Structures are given as C-alpha cells and as structure tokens.
Structure 1
Amino acid sequence: SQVRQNFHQDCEAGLNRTVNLKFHSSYVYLSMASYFNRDDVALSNFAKFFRERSAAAKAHAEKLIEYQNQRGGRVFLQSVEKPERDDWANGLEALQTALKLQKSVNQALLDLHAVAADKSDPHMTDFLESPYLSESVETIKKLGDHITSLKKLWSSHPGMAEYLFNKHTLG
C-alpha cells in the first residue's frame, strides 16, 4: 500500500479482531432489545436502551473498518457469532450481562492500545483514546449506576421495580 506508514502487522490484525468483537456486542444488544419487546416482557424503554447500545457498537465497528483503510491496512471480516442466550431472564440480569460485556470490550481496547504503544504508533493510540476508550468508561459508569438503582427497587418488589425503572430512568 502506497499509503502505509508506521503501521505494524500486529496493529492491523488487532484492529480486525476488534471489529468482530464490536459486531458481536451489537448482535448481543439486538437480542436484548428484541427480548424486551416480547408481549410477555413488555418493557419498551429497556428495549430502546439496548437498541441504542446496539447501534453505538455497530457504528464503532464501522469506524474501525474505516481507520484500517485510512492507514493502508486490509480489512478481513470474520463470521459473527450469535449471542449466548435468546432469553435474558429479566431487566436486572440483562443490565448485569451488559456491564460484563462492556468491561471485556474495554479490556480488548486497552490491550489494542498497548500494542500500538509498544509499536510506537502515536496516531493509533490517539485514535483509540478518543472516542473509544472514553465512551467505554462512560457507558460502564452509566450501567453501574443503573444496576445500583434497579437493585434497590428489586429488594422491595421485582414486578414493580422493572415497571418503575423502565418509566422513570429509561424513559
């Protein structure tokens, strides 16, 4: 590539692994959004919340693909594995699964950053920091706050907890 400069193979490969990871997350959230729209779950604002997370993860995957092209790397897409579950039990469990998902995606981004740093690629570390690393920690804080608030309500009544939270926090 006539454009390629100071772009290491390990950074190119790591970038391709990270887009698959982002697509996988998006698919997971899509599953959650669809689950909450079921007539027997009926929590429209939980669904909306996960639909937004799904869209955000997908956009991230797309921007990482664009970055690959801009640096002169070659995009290699892999199959996207289905979510681990089709039934997400309830709103608290879905929220907790999302926190763990976001934390593992954050770790992958941290690891990718470390490779760019080790390879002395200031352009990539800069790109990874804003907005990827920053959106990650914000989302993690928001999910953590949400889990705390829902847990407090859960202790009183789970039926009412989900209904109230869906309305006052997610709405």
Structure 2
Amino acid sequence: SQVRQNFHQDCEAGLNRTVNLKFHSSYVYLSMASYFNRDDVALSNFAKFFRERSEEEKEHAEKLIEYQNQRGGRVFLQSVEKPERDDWANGLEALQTALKLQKSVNQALLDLHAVAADKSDPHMTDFLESPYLSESVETIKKLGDHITSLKKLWSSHPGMAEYLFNKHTLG
C-alpha cells in the first residue's frame, strides 16, 4: 500500500482479530437483549441496556475496520461465532456474564496495545487509548456497580429485585 508506514504485520493481524472479537461481543449482547424481551422474562429496560451495549460494540468493530484502511492494512473478516447461550437465566446472571465479557475484551485491547507499543507505533497506541481503553474501564465500573446493587436486592426477593432494578436503575 502506498499509504503504509510504520505499520507492522502483527498490528495489522491483531486488528483483524479484534474486530471479530467486537462483532462476537455485539452478538452476545443482542442475544441478551432478545432474551429480556421474551414474554416470559419481560424486563424491557434490561433489554434496552443490552441493546445499547450491542450497538456500541458494533460501532467499535466498524471503527477498527476503518482504522485498518487508514493505515494501509487489509481487512480480513472471519465468521462470527454465535453466543455461548440462548437462555440467560436472569438479570443478575446476565450482568455477571457481561462483566466477564467486558474484561476479556479489555484484556484483548490491552494485549493489542502492548503489540503496538513493542513495535513503536505511537499512532496506534494513541488510537487504542481513546476511546477504546477508556470506554472499557468506564463500562466495567458501571457493570460492577450494577451487579452490586442488584445483589443487594436479590437477597430479599429476586422477583422484586429484577422488577425494581429494571425500573429504577435501568429506567
């Protein structure tokens, strides 16, 4: 590419691997959103929350593809594996799964950042820091807070816990 400069093959490859990860996360959130809209689950604000997370992950994936093109790298798309589950049990289990998902995506971004740093690519480390790394920790803190609040309510009554949380925290 006539545009390529100081762009290492490992960074190009890591980038392609990361967009797949982001699409997979988006897909997991979409599954969760759909689950909460089921007539036998009916937690509309949990659904809304996960739907928003889904769209955010999707937009990140698209921005990474755009970054690949900007640097003169070549995009290679892979199949997107379906979520690990189709039933997410309940609001608390879904939140806990999301925290685990967010931390694995954060680790992937940190690993990619380390590759860019090792290859001395300041443009890429800068790109990864904001907003990718920053949004990750913000989301992780938010999910941790949510889990704590829901757990407090859970100890009294799980049925009422989900209903009240859906209304007061997610509404």
- The TM-score range, normalised by the shorter chain, is over 0.9
**Equivalent in the alignment of 1:121:** 121
4+ residue stretches of structure 1 with deviation over 2 A?
Answer: none
Match runs of 1:157-168 below 5 Å: 157-168=157-168
Deviation at 1:93, TM superposition (A): 0.1
Deviation at 1:121, TM superposition (A): 0.1
Q: Deviations over 1:62-119 (max 9, x none)?
A: 0000000000000000000000000000000000000000000000000000000000
Instruction: State how far apart, in whole Å, the 2-side matches of 1:88 and 1:123 are.
Output: 39
TM-score scaled to structure 2, two decimals? Answer: 1.00
**Equivalent in the alignment of 1:4:** 4
TM-score scaled to structure 1, two decimals? Answer: 1.00
Identity score, percent: 98
Instruction: State how far apart, in whole Å, the 1-side matches of 2:84 and 2:132 are.
Output: 25
Deviation at 1:48, TM superposition (A): 0.1
Deviation at 1:58, TM superposition (A): 0.1
Q: Deviations over 1:19-41 (max 9, x none)?
A: 00000000000000000000000
Task: Please list every run of 5 or more consecutive structure 2 residues that lacks an aligned counterpart in the other structure.
Answer: none
Instruction: State how far apart, in whole Å, the 2-side matches of 1:26 and 1:117 are.
Output: 27
Instruction: State how far apart, in whole Å, the 1-side matches of 2:58 and 2:5 are.
Output: 27
Q: Deviations over 1:48-68 (max 9, x none)?
A: 000000000000000000000
Deviation at 1:156, TM superposition (A): 0.2
Give the secondary structure class of the aligned counterpart of 2:51: helix
Task: Please list every run of 5 or more consecutive structure 1 residues that lacks an aligned counterpart in the other structure.
Answer: none
Q: Deviations over 1:111-136 (max 9, x none)?
A: 00000000000000000000000000
Instruction: State how far apart, in whole Å, the 2-side matches of 1:112 and 1:162 are.
Output: 37
1:21 aligns with 2:17: no
Instruction: State how far apart, in whole Å, the 2-side matches of 1:54 and 1:159 are.
Output: 26
Instruction: State how far apart, in whole Å, the 1-side matches of 2:99 and 2:141 are.
Output: 9
Instruction: State how far apart, in whole Å, the 2-side matches of 1:34 and 1:25 are.
Output: 14
Aligned length, in residue pairs = 171
- Superposed CA RMSD in Å reads 0.1
